[PDB]
Design an enzyme around this catalytic site. Structure first.
Site, PDB file in Angstrom:
ATOM      1  N   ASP A 132      31.912  19.138 -60.633  1.00 52.34           N
ATOM      2  CA  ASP A 132      32.663  18.525 -61.813  1.00 52.34           C
ATOM      3  C   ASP A 132      31.967  18.315 -63.113  1.00 52.34           C
ATOM      4  O   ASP A 132      30.576  17.621 -62.959  1.00 52.34           O
ATOM      5  CB  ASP A 132      33.110  16.687 -61.277  1.00 52.34           C
ATOM      6  N   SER A 166      39.426  21.899 -80.559  1.00 50.29           N
ATOM      7  CA  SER A 166      39.927  23.309 -80.251  1.00 50.29           C
ATOM      8  C   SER A 166      40.787  22.642 -81.625  1.00 50.29           C
ATOM      9  O   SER A 166      41.422  21.943 -82.078  1.00 50.29           O
ATOM     10  CB  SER A 166      41.556  23.420 -79.252  1.00 50.29           C
TER      11      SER A 166
END
EC number: 3.4.23.22
Length: 330
Positions: free
Chosen positions: A35, A199
């Site tokens: 994780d 992004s």
């Protein structure tokens, strides 16, 4: 030194991935969920409330000659999906795919939330975010990656998650045979303890690329892709009959539909998520409504590039003193 381990989806929907990890002497092998959205290594153990253990493999520190109780240390975690666990702390030897760390904090769960109990295939979590998010008190502990950083050939690990198929986590080297083209690197902010990057935009299907900054985290521990409401609405507008459902808690679509792909930007490069990756199957057995893999982040507060997006790419987690994230097509 280096390490390499195969990671396997737990079910036919790729809801999570498990990776075998050796803990203790002699080795006790547990299947952990790697994780990058948390920083605690915690396991089901002999100390877990027996009613809360439903088929998991448990770590038994009394059978490990190298286990040492970390006196007075406790831990307590609450995950984004309203999951929680807590317990005490041991240190032990931990190995991943041949890569060994001595004196790693192994957090033994005394109680776990019901969601972990229902999931007999996951024996625990291995956190790979930054160590500032570790919940051990009063002495914070380092992650497995932080402890291994010095002996690694290169201070990197890579995630190569498979679509309905096994994948690989590599530590200390970049397998140049596992991707195509070039790796595009992008800056990482560590200010909240996550692998946080920006992004450069998105496209739906074969539509125009929309240049817009989407700040979000690379999180192998989250199944779906969570993006701002404006982006998610534009995606599902291209799926006939799709709609947001309050009873289900997200976008659903007719299982007979074909889903368009989703492209997200990494600097000047583009990563394409095939439409099949976004299909997460019927909301209930026999239903003709299917659950979507792209959902709104509005209720979460943070955009999450989860497994849906990461498994479309070869992803480098570069833990150099100035950390970066690398994306490559594969």
């Amino acid at each position: 030194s280096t390490g390499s381990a195969t990671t396997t989806p737990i079910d036919s929907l790729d809801d999570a991935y498990i990776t075998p990890v050796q803990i203790g002497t002699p080795a006790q092998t547990l299947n952990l969920d790697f994780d990058t959205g948390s920083s605690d290594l915690w396991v089901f153990s002999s100390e877990t409330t027996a009613s809360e253990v439903d088929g998991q493999t448990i770590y038994t520190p009394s059978k490990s000659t190298t286990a040492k109780l970390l006196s007075g240390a406790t831990w307590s975690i609450s995950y984004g999906d309203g999951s929680s666990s807590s317990g005490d702390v041991y240190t032990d030897t931990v190995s991943v795919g041949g890569l060994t760390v001595t004196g790693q904090a192994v957090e033994s769960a005394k109680k776990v939330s019901s969601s972990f109990t229902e999931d007999s295939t996951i024996d625990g979590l291995l956190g790979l975010a930054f160590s500032t998010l570790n919940t051990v008190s009063p002495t914070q502990q380092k992650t497995f990656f932080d402890n291994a950083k010095a002996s690694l050939d290169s201070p990197v690990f890579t995630a190569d998650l498979g679509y309905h198929a096994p994948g690989t986590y590599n530590f200390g080297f970049i397998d140049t045979t596992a991707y195509t083209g070039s790796i595009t690197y992008t800056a990482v902010s560590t200010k909240q303890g996550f692998w946080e990057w920006t992004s450069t935009g998105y496209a739906v299907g074969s539509g125009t690329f929309k240049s817009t900054s989407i700040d979000g985290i690379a999180d192998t521990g989250t199944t779906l892709l969570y993006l701002p409401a404006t982006v998610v609405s534009a995606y599902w507008a291209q799926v006939s009959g799709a709609k947001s459902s309050s009873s289900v808690g997200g976008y659903v679509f007719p299982c007979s539909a074909t889903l368009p792909s989703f492209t997200f930007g990494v600097g000047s490069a583009r990563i394409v998520i095939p439409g099949d990756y976004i299909d997460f199957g019927p909301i209930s057995t026999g239903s003709s409504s299917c659950f979507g893999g792209i959902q709104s982040s509005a209720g979460i507060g943070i955009n999450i590039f989860g497994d849906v997006a990461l498994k479309a790419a070869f992803v480098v987690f570069n833990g150099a003193t100035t950390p970066t994230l690398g994306f490559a097509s594969k």
